Structures are given as structure tokens and as C-alpha cells.
Design an enzyme around this catalytic site. Structure first.
Site, mmCIF file in Angstrom:
data_model
loop_
_atom_site.group_PDB
_atom_site.id
_atom_site.type_symbol
_atom_site.label_atom_id
_atom_site.label_comp_id
_atom_site.label_asym_id
_atom_site.label_seq_id
_atom_site.Cartn_x
_atom_site.Cartn_y
_atom_site.Cartn_z
ATOM 1 N N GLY A 1 -7.797 -3.443 -8.341
ATOM 2 C CA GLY A 1 -9.173 -3.751 -8.681
ATOM 3 C C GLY A 1 -9.436 -3.741 -10.169
ATOM 4 N N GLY A 2 -10.523 -3.083 -10.563
ATOM 5 C CA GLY A 2 -10.896 -3.024 -11.964
ATOM 6 C C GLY A 2 -9.827 -2.475 -12.879
ATOM 7 N N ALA B 1 6.993 -31.511 -30.873
ATOM 8 C CA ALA B 1 7.579 -30.187 -30.932
ATOM 9 C C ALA B 1 7.962 -29.829 -32.354
ATOM 10 C CB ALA B 1 8.799 -30.116 -30.023
HETATM 11 C C1 LIG Z 1 -13.728 -2.657 -8.068
HETATM 12 C C2 LIG Z 1 -12.544 -1.852 -7.614
HETATM 13 C C3 LIG Z 1 -12.553 -1.797 -6.119
HETATM 14 O O1 LIG Z 1 -13.369 -2.371 -5.459
HETATM 15 S S1 LIG Z 1 -11.294 -0.816 -5.393
HETATM 16 C C4 LIG Z 1 -11.991 -0.580 -3.741
HETATM 17 C C5 LIG Z 1 -11.018 0.196 -2.903
HETATM 18 N N1 LIG Z 1 -9.651 -0.151 -3.241
HETATM 19 C C6 LIG Z 1 -8.592 0.523 -2.792
HETATM 20 O O2 LIG Z 1 -7.532 0.541 -3.408
HETATM 21 C C7 LIG Z 1 -8.749 1.298 -1.503
HETATM 22 C C8 LIG Z 1 -7.418 1.868 -1.074
HETATM 23 N N2 LIG Z 1 -6.315 0.984 -1.433
HETATM 24 C C9 LIG Z 1 -5.047 1.185 -1.101
HETATM 25 O O3 LIG Z 1 -4.428 0.412 -0.375
HETATM 26 C C10 LIG Z 1 -4.350 2.412 -1.665
HETATM 27 O O4 LIG Z 1 -5.301 3.325 -2.186
HETATM 28 C C11 LIG Z 1 -3.322 2.099 -2.760
HETATM 29 C C12 LIG Z 1 -4.032 1.802 -4.085
HETATM 30 C C13 LIG Z 1 -2.474 0.885 -2.374
HETATM 31 C C14 LIG Z 1 -2.420 3.317 -2.923
HETATM 32 O O5 LIG Z 1 -1.863 3.619 -1.619
HETATM 33 P P1 LIG Z 1 -1.334 5.099 -1.312
HETATM 34 O O6 LIG Z 1 -0.535 5.532 -2.491
HETATM 35 O O7 LIG Z 1 -0.705 5.095 0.040
HETATM 36 O O8 LIG Z 1 -2.689 5.944 -1.232
HETATM 37 P P2 LIG Z 1 -3.667 6.148 0.014
HETATM 38 O O9 LIG Z 1 -4.139 4.788 0.397
HETATM 39 O O10 LIG Z 1 -2.995 6.969 1.057
HETATM 40 O O11 LIG Z 1 -4.887 6.984 -0.620
HETATM 41 C C15 LIG Z 1 -4.666 8.294 -1.205
HETATM 42 C C16 LIG Z 1 -5.983 9.001 -1.425
HETATM 43 O O12 LIG Z 1 -6.790 8.263 -2.379
HETATM 44 C C17 LIG Z 1 -8.065 8.022 -1.836
HETATM 45 N N3 LIG Z 1 -8.547 6.759 -2.379
HETATM 46 C C18 LIG Z 1 -7.789 5.638 -2.581
HETATM 47 N N4 LIG Z 1 -8.458 4.647 -3.102
HETATM 48 C C19 LIG Z 1 -9.733 5.149 -3.278
HETATM 49 C C20 LIG Z 1 -10.901 4.573 -3.800
HETATM 50 N N5 LIG Z 1 -10.968 3.333 -4.263
HETATM 51 N N6 LIG Z 1 -12.010 5.340 -3.833
HETATM 52 C C21 LIG Z 1 -11.930 6.592 -3.378
HETATM 53 N N7 LIG Z 1 -10.889 7.237 -2.865
HETATM 54 C C22 LIG Z 1 -9.803 6.453 -2.841
HETATM 55 C C23 LIG Z 1 -7.823 7.991 -0.335
HETATM 56 O O13 LIG Z 1 -9.009 8.158 0.409
HETATM 57 C C24 LIG Z 1 -6.871 9.171 -0.203
HETATM 58 O O14 LIG Z 1 -7.660 10.332 -0.358
HETATM 59 P P3 LIG Z 1 -7.166 11.528 0.600
HETATM 60 O O15 LIG Z 1 -6.602 12.604 -0.300
HETATM 61 O O16 LIG Z 1 -6.117 10.942 1.518
HETATM 62 O O17 LIG Z 1 -8.391 11.997 1.354
#
Ligand SMILES: CCC(=O)SCCNC(=O)CCNC(=O)[C@H](O)C(C)(C)COP(=O)(O)OP(=O)(O)OC[C@H]1O[C@@H](n2cnc3c(N)ncnc32)[C@H](O)[C@@H]1OP(=O)(O)O
Ligand SMILES: CCC/C=C/C=C/C/C=C/CCCCCCCCCC(=O)SCCNC(=O)CCNC(=O)[C@H](O)C(C)(C)COP(=O)(O)OP(=O)(O)OC[C@H]1O[C@@H](n2cnc3c(N)ncnc32)[C@H](O)[C@@H]1OP(=O)(O)O
Ligand SMILES: *C(=O)CCCC[C@@H]1SC[C@@H]2NC(=O)N[C@@H]21
Lengths: 69, 172, 344, 70, 406, 135, 135
Positions: free
Chosen positions: E50-51, E293
Site C-alpha cells: 500500500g502506501g 543516438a
Molecule cells: C493504504 C494502505 C492500505 O490500504 S493497506 C490495507 C491493509 N493491507 C494489508 O496489508 C492487510 C494485510 N496484508 C497482508 O497480506 C499481510 O499483512 C502482509 C503485508 C502480506 C504480511 O503478511 P504476514 O507477514 O503473514 O502478516 P499477517 O498477515 O499474518 O499479519 C500480522 C499481524 O499484522 C496485523 N496487520 C497486518 N496488516 C495490518 C494493517 N494494515 N493494519 C493493521 N494491522 C495489520 C495483523 O492483523 C496481524 O496482527 P496479529 O498480531 O496477528 O493480531
């Protein structure tokens, strides 16, 4: 992927490998005449030349698979 | 020229000159440095520079009287303009310096034919026009309104690139 | 069939050896007949050994089978006392050294270079007359070269060495520069030569009376007259040793801190001024004592000799000295003294 | 040879006294000769903080010269 | 001072809502403010979603870690929902994707310590800010002329260019022989390999190299290489690093896809970057420099301060087989009416054109080449020019900013 | 980059959606927008409500699934609560990222009045030779 | 003052040598100097080939005339030789291609007078230079 592929359309002037030869990244695989250059196409990874598909004097098109490493 | 540049007046050059006056008295009077100061001032000036050639523009007269090479902005010539390094008679004279027999009829014929050819082919507007040393050859009646159009275009001239510094030096 | 890389490099080396004497054997012979050095030999004697890098050695007039390499000028860069300079030298063996198009373009390129780096430029002038076969081109390029002093005046020191007959249009670029040094009986400067002065005005005049080095020095067109080109090069070195490279940088500091106490030479000043008010004396007796040492480097000494304009150093820092000379005309400030002082 | 040498203006040391002296003086040497690693960094230079009149000559002789001097 | 960001985060913290977007906006605004003012280096060491991606995109250099780092705006699940495409995070946004495909990563480290080492190498070339000089190492220059100070490694350049103009050579062999200690920090080495860009030192002084690479697409310019070299040039010029171009370019890569993807608009960025640049610009021509070029790759009238050519340089409007078609088209038509061996006529006319014009000397005659030099002299000419042009007193017309093609 | 560097008067009218990073790109306040106004239909949010509720109230939807509840109906009700609470102009207006929420008819008047106010701007930026835009 | 270029030319004049390339370089360097200083407008009213394409790309606005103007670096015949692709000059470089595909043309006029009208309209919105007051 393992496919070495012709980056340009051109004429195969020489093949620098044989089927089943080991090759290392940056080893020469073929010489393609394209754009008036004896362009080297080289192996991108270590492995073994399989499916050697090209012949001396053959014209080949871009994206032709030359060999799989 | 320095005064006019200081008070932002555009400069109009109206040319009919053989160049610097020759002679021992002018050389001893300082003609080299004084011409050098005239050259210095004309290049120094930032104001709009427009030139009209009427007849002669020989040598340093051509150069100093707002030539394009010395940073004049727009250069016009009447069809009577004659732009050259030297006039026909000066070119003929050096021509006749070699094989000098100035009493003979034949060398006077050679001079006359040389001057005729020179004033037809060399001392004209047309070589400078074809090389773009001047921007246009104009009918004389166009001059007033063409000056208006030109100086309207040039009204906001910014002269650069120039490196700011204490001052320019001049032959002095 | 193309040539090999080795063959191309051999061709380059032999073409560069040609371009070092592009006028060919006959012009070399005519130069040795007159006893003058070549333009490159001059540059190499001016510059620090081996510092010269030539620019545009292989330039030629476009569309001219009779063009010769370099078009009549040598241009490049090097060092004097380890400090950057640009230099050009007229080559009278090619088209008599007349101003062609590529001659103009090369000298313009050099003038832009020294403006861009901010270093001095030295011109070695001997003859840059109008080119017989294309005089309108010579007129245009005299003007084009002239115009580019706009980049240099008061930004970097410009020096002209007058080693030949500077005549016609050739006088106007040197007279813009800050220091003109002429070789006696060799350098001359004049707009219109004796022949045309005769045939226009009827007057008779010699080269020496019209534009000889000591006459032009007394008139103040020339700042220095020397007896040889080597002396010209040394005057240029000494001159540049008092100066910054450009309007921004610092000058070199030479021997700071000498003689920090009152010396006997300081005490001689207490009795140096004559008792009687009418008596003249040589001001150099004072100038040789009030600065760091005897290195009072005088400029335009012949021009208005009632006035001294010189460089000197104070605690190693260069200064300009303007002094009256009571030994000459009681030290009255005349026409030439006034303009010498104002320029300096 | 135009370096300024150390001179023993008075006294005549033995070789061992000369060695002791020179070792001490060299240990007392000023360290590295000059800070040749010093680098130009004109960020936030005091001359940029001054108010200049729009027509101030110090724009040429102070501000510009300080930026351009090298 | 330089700003290093180590980026690793799942985008906006969703529970906080729009305030996180406001802080992203402020971060981006500061990156844009800092752009060209202080060096900005972004390490990517995990998944940035994302951002989180836009700040690195705005910094000057992006270093990614192989396998363990990713950047993507929108994840594979949304991509599957909207487009049907199935992709892994690694295929979507891994370091290899952003090196080879998207041209966003400047380096792909084998691991975290390798990424840190690359960042320290970068900073060793960069000044702290645009008002400061790049850190200059003191180097003992030999005394004497360029000819007198040639080394054996310099003499190796005299034989490097193949005798055949159809044979490629690896331009790194030139780069590492002109640079100090052979040390070249290549930037973005896995993208648009037809151009090589990176940092080195000459006599202690940082330089940016931009060089055509004959071994890839014959060294033609294309869209991706143009954008790679354009932004490298603008970064060097922001931070006072002088540039050296090593030129062996036959032209632009022909193809309909280059036109449709905007070779005109996007290739013009490299013209603009080079023409904007006011650091010292040195050109070394090593064989080909043709046509547009030639204009792009550091021509004299684009403001190249020093242009030197090797004896093998070939500077021409176009290749002789093309040129003959037009400059002798009448003669070929007359011979065709006479029924002559017009193929042998074309070969003879082409050989004459090559022998007359396809060389360095016509450009040297015009003064577009400052000197035609033995290849061994290259390092000496570069070192001299770069020493003299530390400060260049050049200026552009006053402007708020330019309007580079985008 | 282009929006952030621009120093002319910058006015933003949000008509309906402005989500995520695109809210940042399309003339956000902290990207230096001088005046931001929103219509009542504006929707300013980190992401669409389906994704947001797919994330917050995750786990809750999963224990609803383990308890065998109609998790699709729960997901719908959570979506509606999120849309009604947050997907509107007013959280941004409360944080002052929107300067006013206006009737759409007022748009021409607001734009004209803002442009007249902003006709002279001074904005001060660090000195640079030039910026380094992405290329 | 604004510069208007009307472009219609088959590249470098091949009988003239590299001198033509030196003049192209000087022209491009002037386009880059002028960039963001004076409005630069390029009309394409014929086939612009080779070196003729970069000056338009460096100017601020490009107006092409539909079906009667083209821009391309490399001609169809060289493309055919190097890649085997058959393409007409209109497909390769037409006004529609440079509008819809490559994003290089800012307007596609239905004819020459329509192109001039668009240029006059553009100019009516622009100041003469980067420091004059707007109209
Ligand atoms: C403008 C920017 C946006 O709109 S971003 C909106 C949400 N985007 C996201 O990335 C949501 C989640 N995406 C994912 O697929 C994963 O977080 C990614 C980035 C790929 C990492 O995967 P992985 O390493 O397995 O982590 P996970 O998914 O198990 O999450 C771990 C903990 O982090 C948290 N988390 C994650 N992303 C967010 C977020 N955007 N806002 C708030 N909390 C977030 C998860 O809930 C999790 O927390 P917990 O400790 O398991 O409770
Ligand atoms: C804050 C920042 C601000 C800073 C701002 C700074 C701004 C600064 C700006 C500064 C601006 C600078 C501006 C510069 C202006 C450009 C100058 C204008 C051009 C001319 O002003 S242009 C006229 C040319 N004129 C005269 O002038 C006088 C009149 N003068 C004449 O009218 C005659 O010229 C003469 C005689 C009097 C002069 O003397 P001569 O003519 O030089 O000599 P000669 O003819 O006697 O020599 C012998 C002849 O024999 C011939 N020949 C044949 N075969 C051979 C052979 N095998 N070998 C040798 N010779 C041969 C050959 O023709 C040769 O002549 P050559 O080779 O043609 O010289
Ligand atoms: C050779 O057979 C003629 C076609 C190839 C000409 C080369 S290709 C790469 C360069 N780009 C271009 O447009 N012409 C050059």
C-alpha cells in the site's frame, strides 16, 4: 524459468554448447546475428543444457526457446 | 552607448561607413583603443539592439555598427547595402600592388574590371543575407513600421548568460 | 573490408604526426628561413613541461580539399607554475595564419573553456590577417571572437604576446586583453600599414614609427617590451604569480612573515627624502624598501613615466602600487599617467 | 637543497644525546601535517542567513563571492 | 544530512482510519521536498504494501533484499478478485520483479548484510547535501604528460576493441580500466542491460559512468535504458557528481512496441537529463555513435565539456548500407535500367562510403570531437577534465523548474 | 511528485470516493492542497468497507463461523455499520483534512473565492539545483 | 515569448554529414534551456522522421493532424528488416497512435485550421513567459 530464449530475431551463426553439457551463469550458449551484431546469448544460471533446439544457420524468432538449463 | 544602456534605451544603428579612418594622425591619436572601447560598449550593452544598413559596411565599420556577431538582436539591410572586408578600390589597390605597373593602360583596365566584378558579386547585401549574418533585406519604405514591430518584440529582452561580477574592464 | 584496430591506431599516430606540421615541408623551410619557432614550439616553451593538451588539432575547413589541419591556430590548455591556463598560438605556416572559420571556432571554444573553468588565457599573436580566399568569413570570425571577451573581461586575466605584425582586424582582440607584451623589432601593432597610408594620404612612414614596440609602449597600447620570446614567457610567469586565477579565487601567498622587526633598510627611509624641495629623486629607492622585498614588478613602465604602476607583496600578499615618480617631469600627473593609473 | 633544517646553534651533543633529542622532538611533532580530508560543505553558511537589500552590493562582494570562491 | 529509511510494513494501520493517510501524505511531501536536496536511500527488507511503496519510489536509491522483500500497491487477493489473475507475492512484487521488469529497484542484495554494504558503498560516493562536494580521496598523481604516465592497464585499452565492427565486447572491461582500483559500484545492474550505469573514482574523485553495452541489443538505446540513464544522470547532477559517457551506440532499438510504449516521449528524458546537467560531462566514443543516438549520448552541442574519440570510433548520420540507398539512389536506378550487377554496385558504393565518412575524422574536422586519442590516453584525458571542471561557471535561464517529458 | 512540488494555488473538490493511497495522490491537505472541500456524498477512507471489515472484525467473523452463525449476514451487517460510521466526509472534516463540507451547488462559488484568496502565495522550499523526479 | 514550431521533415539531410547532427543537438539543447521558461508548442503537419521527433517531445504541447501527420524514429522498412513486422507508417506513427497508445500527442486535429484553432486556444490560457502576468 530455465528456458534460455532468443532475445532478438536473428540468424544462428554458432552454438557454443552441446546437449547435456554443464554450463555456468555467463557461459556462452549461442551467437545470433541480429542488428549486424554477433550477439552472444548466455546461460543465466548453472545447470545442464537440455532440449537444445537450434541449428547453425537457422533463423529464429524472438522468444524462441534455445535450451533449458 | 553606455549611457543609453544605463538608462535602458534601445539602440538603433544606422550604418553607412567605410570603417576606421586611416592615417598616422589617427593611430597616434589612439584609434585602436578608442575603437576597442566602442566595441566593448556595444557588446556590454544589455538593451535591445536593432541595425539598418544603408550602403557601406566595410571592415570594422560593419563589425562595430551593431553587427549580429557583436550581439545585435535584429539586423536589416537596404538593397543598397554593401557588406565587405574592404571596399572595391582597396581590394583593387592590393590587386595592383602585385605586378605593379600602374602607368599602363592594361592595369587600369584590370582595375576597372575588378571593381565592376567586386561591386557586383562581393560588396553587396546578398552574401551576408545568404549566410544569415543579417536577418533581412528590406525595401527602404518598410523601415519605420519594421522598427516598431522589432522593438515591440524585443521590449522585454533579458541578456544572458552573463556572470555577475564587480564590473567589466575596458581598454583604458 | 575494414581495417584492423591496430591499423586504425597506426593511422591515427601518423595522422597526428602530420597535424603537428600541417603546412608541410615548404612552410617549415620558409619558417626556418625567417628563423622563427613554430606555434607549438612557442606554446611548449611557455607552458610547464609536458602540460600541454591540444584541442582541435585535426580541425579543417569544411568542404575544402585544400584545407590544412588546424586551420592556422594551435589551441589548448596546460599549466604555468602548476596553475591552469588556456593558450592559443597563431600558426603563420597554414594559410599565413589568417582567420578562417575553424580558426574562429577553435579560439571561441577555448575562450568559452577558460570562462567555464575560470583560468587565465594567453594568446600568442603573430599574424592573423584576413583570409584571401574567404575574407567575409574572416570578417565574421574576427567579430565572433571579439564578442566572446564578454565572458572574460574582469573575470579571468587575458594576456597577449605580440610576436609579429598585428595588423588590420587583428588589433582589436589583443587591445581588449589585460596585458600586452611585445618583442622588440618583431612585434608590431597597427590598423593600416605604411603602403596604404601612403596611397591614401600620401604620407611616408616606417613600420617602427607607425607601430613599433617601443612607440606603442610609449603610447600605452603595449604594457611591456622585451628582447626575446623567452623573456616574454618569463614576464608572463612573474605577472601571473601576483594574481588569482579569476575574479573569485585567492592569489598565491609568497614568503609571508619575513623581517618582522624594524630593519636597517627601514631606517634608510628616514634620510632618503632630499633636504631641498626642488631636488628630484628616484621613487624606486622607497618602493624597494617599503614592501616585503625587491620584487616590485612594474607594468607599462614606458607609458607615462611620471607614474609607477607595479605589483608588490605585503606580508606575502600581492598589492597594486601607484606611485608618483619625481625623477620624471617632477612627478606631475599627465595624460598618460592618468590613464595608466585608471586602467591599473 | 632548500629545506629549513633544525640547527644546533650552540652545544655539541654526542650521538646518543642527538638520538634522544630527535626521538623526543619527533614524538612532540604536531601529528598529521594538515587536515587534507577537510571537505567543502556550504549548507547553512552564515552569509546565507543575512538580510540583503534587493539592491545591496554585498550580494556581489559578500554573498556571491563566498559561494563562488574555491 | 542523508536520510536512510528501512521499510517493512503492511501499509496503513486500518483501525486508525484516515489519520494514517494524512501522515502518509505528510511523509510523501517531505520526500518530495528533500528530493535533490539530501540523498535519500530506501532499504526494502520485508513486504511493503500500500502506501509504504510510494516513499521508496520518491527516494533516490532503492535497495531490495532477494526473496525476503516485496513491494506492491495492491495484494494478490484483490488482484484475483478483480482480474482473475493468480500470482504470488513474490511474482507480483519481489526484488527480481522490481529489478528486471519494473525498473524500480537499484540493487538486489543477497541478504541483509549485503544490502547494508551496498548502502555504505553508495554513501561513500555521495555528498551529505547538494551544497557540498562529494568526498574526495587524496591520491598521489604521477608527474608528466599523459603519454609519459601510461600504465600497462592503460595499454590494455589499445587492443580491446575487436577488429570486426560486428563483434561485441563487454564495456565493463573499459569501465574498470579507467576507474581507480578497478572498483565499480554498478547501479541497477539487472535492468535494461543494454546500458551500464554506476559510480567509481578517478584520482580519488567520484564519477558517474553511463556506458552503452554492445553485448545487449548491440548497445541500442531503448525505452528502459533511456529511463535508467536519465534518472542516474539527474541524481549525479543533483549531487555534484560529474559524469563520463562511454559511447558505442548504433541507434535506437527498432520495433513497433518501442513506438507504442513511447520511445519518443520516454527516450527524450535522456536528452533532457544530459542537457540539463551542469556537472562536468565527459564523452569517450569507442566505436559507434550514429544519428539521434549520437545526439543523445553526449554530443558536443548538447554541452559535452570534453569529447574524445578512439581510432575505432564511427560517427555518422547512419550506417553506410542505409546511407548509400539515398546518396546514390540515382546511380543505382541508372544501373538498374542498364541491367547491371547493382548488388556489386551497392557493395562498392558502400565500401567507398565507409572509407570516406564512417570514421572519427569528419566530426574531428568539424570540432565535434576535441581529440582523437589512442585508447590508452582515456584515463588521462578524463582525469584532467574532471580536475579542471570541479566548479563549472555555467547557468540556465531562471525558472521555477523545467518540464521534462514524463 | 508533480502535485507536491507545485506551488501555484491548489484547490480540491472531493465528489464521492477518495480511498487509500489515491486519496494521498489526489490533492490531499498534507500534500499541500490549499483548500479542500467535500460534497456530502464524499467517501474518505483507508479502503473500501468490504476490505476494512474483512480485516477488522476478522477473527470475530471466524469465531462466528466456528459457532456456525450466518457469517455472510454478519459480514453484511458489519459492512453496513462501517459504511454508516466511517465512509463519509466527516472523519476527515473532524481532523481538518477537509476544510468544509459543502452543498454541491456551492462548488463554483467556493472555487472562485478560494482562487481569489490564493492569487498570491509564498511557499518556501529548501534550496536545490533541481529536483529528482522519478523517471 | 512563446515559440511555435511547425514540424514536417524526413530527418537529417543525409548528404550533409554529421553537421546535421550537430545542429540537431543545438536545437535540442535550446528546447531544454527554454523548458519551463517560454511556452513551446509543436504542430505536426506531416511525416516527422528521425531527429525531427525529439524537439516536439521536448516542447510543452504537441498537436498532430489526424491521418496526415506522423512521428517515428525508425521507418517501417527498417522495422521490417530487423523484426519482420509489417506496419504502415500510419499505424506506426499516426496521430491516433500517438494519442491513444504512446501518450505523446496532446491534441489530434481534424485538419490544419482546426489545429491552428487549438493552438490559439492553448496560447490564450498561457502567459508569454514564466515571469509575466497571466492573460
Ligand atoms: C493504504 C494502505 C492500505 O490500504 S493497506 C490495507 C491493509 N493491507 C494489508 O496489508 C492487510 C494485510 N496484508 C497482508 O497480506 C499481510 O499483512 C502482509 C503485508 C502480506 C504480511 O503478511 P504476514 O507477514 O503473514 O502478516 P499477517 O498477515 O499474518 O499479519 C500480522 C499481524 O499484522 C496485523 N496487520 C497486518 N496488516 C495490518 C494493517 N494494515 N493494519 C493493521 N494491522 C495489520 C495483523 O492483523 C496481524 O496482527 P496479529 O498480531 O496477528 O493480531
Ligand atoms: C560585466 C561584464 C561586461 C563585460 C563586457 C566585455 C565586452 C568586450 C567585447 C569586445 C569586442 C571585440 C570586437 C572585435 C571586432 C572585430 C574586428 C573587425 C574586423 C576588421 O576590422 S577587418 C578590416 C581589415 N583592415 C583594417 O582593419 C584596416 C586597413 N588595413 C588594410 O586595408 C590592409 O590590410 C593593410 C595592408 C593596411 C594591413 O596589413 P595586411 O593587409 O595584413 O598585409 P599585406 O597585404 O601588406 O601583406 C602582404 C600580402 O601579400 C599577399 N600574398 C600573396 N602570396 C603570398 C605568399 N605566398 N606569402 C605571403 N603573402 C602573400 C597577401 O595578400 C598578404 O596580405 P594578408 O596575408 O592578406 O595579410
Ligand atoms: C541492417 O541490416 C539494417 C538494419 C539495422 C540497422 C541498425 S539496428 C539498430 C540501429 N537502430 C536503427 O534504427 N538502425 C540501426
Amino acid at each position: 524459468g530455465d528456458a534460455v530464449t532468443a532475445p532478438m530475431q536473428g540468424t544462428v551463426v554458432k552454438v557454443a554448447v552441446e546437449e547435456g553439457q554443464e554450463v555456468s551463469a555467463g557461459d556462452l550458449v549461442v551467437v545470433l546475428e541480429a542488428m549486424k551484431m554477433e550477439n552472444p546469448v548466455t546461460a543465466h544460471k548453472d545447470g545442464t543444457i537440455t532440449g537444445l533446439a537450434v541449428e547453425a544457420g537457422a533463423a529464429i524468432t524472438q522468444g524462441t526457446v534455445i535450451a533449458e538449463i | 552607448i553606455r549611457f543609453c544602456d544605463s538608462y535602458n534605451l534601445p539602440l538603433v544603428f544606422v550604418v553607412d561607413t567605410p570603417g576606421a579612418m586611416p592615417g598616422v594622425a589617427e593611430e597616434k591619436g589612439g584609434i585602436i583603443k578608442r575603437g576597442g572601447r566602442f566595441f566593448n560598449a556595444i557588446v556590454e550593452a544589455d538593451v535591445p539592439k536593432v541595425t539598418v544598413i544603408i550602403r557601406k559596411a566595410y571592415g570594422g565599420g560593419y563589425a562595430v555598427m551593431g553587427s549580429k556577431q557583436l550581439s545585435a538582436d535584429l539586423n536589416f539591410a537596404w538593397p543598397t547595402a554593401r557588406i565587405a572586408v574592404i571596399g572595391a578600390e582597396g581590394a583593387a589597390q592590393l590587386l595592383v600592388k602585385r605586378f605593379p605597373d600602374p602607368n599602363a593602360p592594361e592595369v587600369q583596365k584590370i582595375r576597372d574590371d575588378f571593381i565592376e566584378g567586386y561591386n557586383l558579386n562581393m560588396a553587396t547585401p546578398w552574401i551576408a543575407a545568404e549566410r544569415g549574418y543579417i536577418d533581412a533585406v528590406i525595401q527602404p519604405h518598410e523601415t519605420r513600421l519594421l522598427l516598431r514591430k522589432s522593438l515591440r518584440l524585443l521590449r522585454d529582452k533579458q541578456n544572458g548568460p552573463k556572470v555577475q561580477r564587480k564590473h567589466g574592464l575596458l581598454p583604458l | 573490408t575494414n581495417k584492423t584496430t591496430a591499423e586504425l591506431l597506426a593511422e591515427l599516430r601518423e595522422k597526428l604526426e602530420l597535424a603537428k606540421e600541417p603546412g608541410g615541408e615548404k612552410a617549415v623551410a620558409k619558417r626556418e628561413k625567417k628563423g622563427i619557432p613554430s606555434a607549438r614550439a612557442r606554446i611548449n616553451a611557455l607552458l610547464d613541461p609536458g602540460s600541454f593538451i591540444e584541442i582541435g588539432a585535426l580541425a579543417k575547413t569544411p568542404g575544402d580539399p585544400n584545407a590544412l589541419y588546424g586551420d592556422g591556430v594551435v589551441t589548448g590548455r596546460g599549466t604555468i607554475d602548476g596553475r591552469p591556463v588556456g593558450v592559443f598560438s597563431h600558426d603563420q605556416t597554414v594559410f599565413q595564419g589568417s582567420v578562417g572559420e575553424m580558426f574562429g571556432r577553435k579560439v571561441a571554444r577555448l575562450m568559452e573553456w577558460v570562462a567555464m573553468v575560470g583560468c587565465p588565457i594567453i594568446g600568442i599573436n603573430d599574424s592573423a590577417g584576413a583570409r584571401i580566399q574567404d575574407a567575409v568569413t574572416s570578417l565574421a570570425w574576427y567579430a565572433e571572437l571579439g564578442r566572446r571577451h564578454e565572458m572574460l573581461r574582469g573575470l579571468v586575466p587575458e594576456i597577449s604576446l605580440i610576436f609579429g605584425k598585428c595588423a588590420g582586424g587583428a588589433v582589436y582582440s589583443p587591445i581588449q586583453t589585460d596585458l600586452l607584451v611585445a618583442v622588440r623589432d618583431q612585434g608590431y601593432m597597427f590598423i593600416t600599414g605604411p603602403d596604404v597610408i601612403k596611397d591614401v594620404t600620401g604620407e611616408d612612414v616606417t613600420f617602427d614609427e607607425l607601430g613599433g614596440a617601443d612607440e606603442q609602449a610609449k603610447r600605452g597600447n603595449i604594457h611591456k617590451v622585451v628582447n626575446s620570446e623567452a623573456e616574454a614567457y618569463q614576464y608572463v610567469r612573474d605577472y601571473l604569480s601576483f594574481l588569482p586565477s579569476n575574479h573569485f579565487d585567492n592569489p598565491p601567498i609568497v614568503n609571508p612573515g619575513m623581517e618582522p622587526e624594524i630593519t636597517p633598510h627601514d631606517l634608510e627611509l628616514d634620510s632618503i627624502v632630499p633636504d631641498a624641495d626642488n631636488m628630484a629623486y628616484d621613487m624606486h629607492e622607497i618602493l624597494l624598501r617599503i614592501f616585503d622585498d625587491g620584487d616590485v614588478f612594474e607594468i607599462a613602465e614606458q607609458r607615462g613615466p611620471a607614474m609607477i604602476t607595479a605589483f608588490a607583496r605585503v606580508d606575502g600578499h600581492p598589492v597594486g602600487v601607484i606611485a608618483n615618480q619625481p625623477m620624471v617631469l617632477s612627478g606631475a600627473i599627465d595624460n598618460e599617467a592618468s590613464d595608466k593609473a585608471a586602467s591599473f | 637543497d632548500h629545506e629549513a633544517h633544525i640547527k644546533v646553534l650552540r652545544g655539541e651533543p654526542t650521538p646518543e644525546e642527538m638520538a634522544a633529542l630527535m626521538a623526543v622532538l619527533a614524538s612532540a611533532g604536531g601529528g598529521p601535517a594538515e587536515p587534507v580530508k577537510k571537505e567543502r560543505n556550504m549548507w547553512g553558511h552564515p552569509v546565507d542567513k543575512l538580510r540583503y537589500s534587493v539592491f545591496s552590493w554585498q550580494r556581489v562582494t559578500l554573498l556571491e563571492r563566498t559561494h563562488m570562491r574555491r | 544530512r542523508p536520510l536512510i529509511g528501512i521499510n517493512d510494513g503492511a501499509g496503513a494501520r486500518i483501525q486508525e482510519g484516515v489519520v494514517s493517510l494524512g501522515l502518509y501524505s505528510r511523509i510523501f511531501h517531505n520526500n518530495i521536498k528533500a528530493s535533490g536536496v539530501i540523498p535519500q536511500i530506501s532499504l526494502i527488507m520485508g513486504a511493503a504494501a500500500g502506501g509504504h511503496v510510494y516513499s521508496p519510489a520518491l527516494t533516490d536509491f532503492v535497495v531490495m533484499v532477494d526473496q525476503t522483500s516485496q513491494m506492491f500497491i495492491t495484494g494478490p487477493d484483490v488482484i484475483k478478485t478483480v482480474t482473475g489473475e493468480d500470482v504470488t507475492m513474490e511474482e507480483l512484487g519481489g526484488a527480481h520483479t522490481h529489478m528486471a521488469k519494473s525498473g524500480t529497484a537499484h540493487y538486489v542484495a543477497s541478504g541483509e548484510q549485503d544490502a547494508f554494504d551496498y548502502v555504505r558503498d553508495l554513501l561513500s560516493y555521495l555528498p551529505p547535501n547538494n551544497y557540498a562536494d562529494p568526498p574526495l580521496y587524496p591520491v598521489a598523481i604521477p608527474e608528466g604528460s599523459i603519454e609519459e604516465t601510461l600504465t600497462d592497464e592503460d595499454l590494455e585499452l589499445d587492443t580491446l576493441i575487436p577488429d570486426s565492427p560486428n563483434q561485441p565486447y563487454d564495456m565493463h572491461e573499459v569501465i574498470t580500466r579507467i576507474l581507480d582500483d578497478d572498483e565499480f559500484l554498478e547501479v541497477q545492474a539487472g535492468y535494461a542491460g543494454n546500458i551500464v550505469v554506476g559510480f567509481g573514482r578517478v584520482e580519488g574523485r567520484p564519477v558517474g559512468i553511463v556506458a552503452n553495452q554492445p553485448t545487449q541489443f548491440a548497445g541500442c538505446l531503448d525505452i528502459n535504458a533511456s529511463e535508467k540513464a536519465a534518472r542516474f544522470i539527474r541524481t549525479c547532477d543533483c549531487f555534484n557528481i560529474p559524469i563520463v559517457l562511454l559511447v558505442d551506440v548504433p541507434g535506437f532499438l527498432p520495433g513497433t512496441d518501442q513506438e507504442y510504449n513511447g520511445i519518443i516521449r520516454r527516450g527524450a528524458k535522456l536528452l533532457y537529463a544530459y542537457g540539463e546537467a551542469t556537472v562536468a560531462k565527459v564523452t569517450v566514443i569507442t566505436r559507434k555513435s550514429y544519428g539521434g543516438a549520437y545526439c543523445v549520448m553526449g554530443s558536443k552541442d548538447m554541452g559535452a565539456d570534453v569529447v574524445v574519440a578512439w581510432p575505432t570510433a564511427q560517427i555518422a548520420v547512419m550506417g553506410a548500407s542505409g546511407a548509400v540507398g539515398f546518396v546514390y539512389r540515382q546511380q543505382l536506378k541508372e544501373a538498374a535500367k542498364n541491367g547491371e550487377d547493382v548488388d556489386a554496385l551497392r557493395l562498392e558504393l558502400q565500401q567507398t562510403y565507409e572509407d570516406t565518412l564512417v570514421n572519427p575524422y569528419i566530426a574531428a574536422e568539424r570540432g565535434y570531437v576535441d581529440a582523437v586519442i589512442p585508447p590508452s590516453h582515456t584515463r588521462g584525458y578524463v582525469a584532467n577534465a574532471l580536475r579542471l571542471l570541479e566548479r563549472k561557471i555555467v547557468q540556465m535561464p531562471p525558472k521555477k523548474h523545467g518540464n521534462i517529458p514524463l
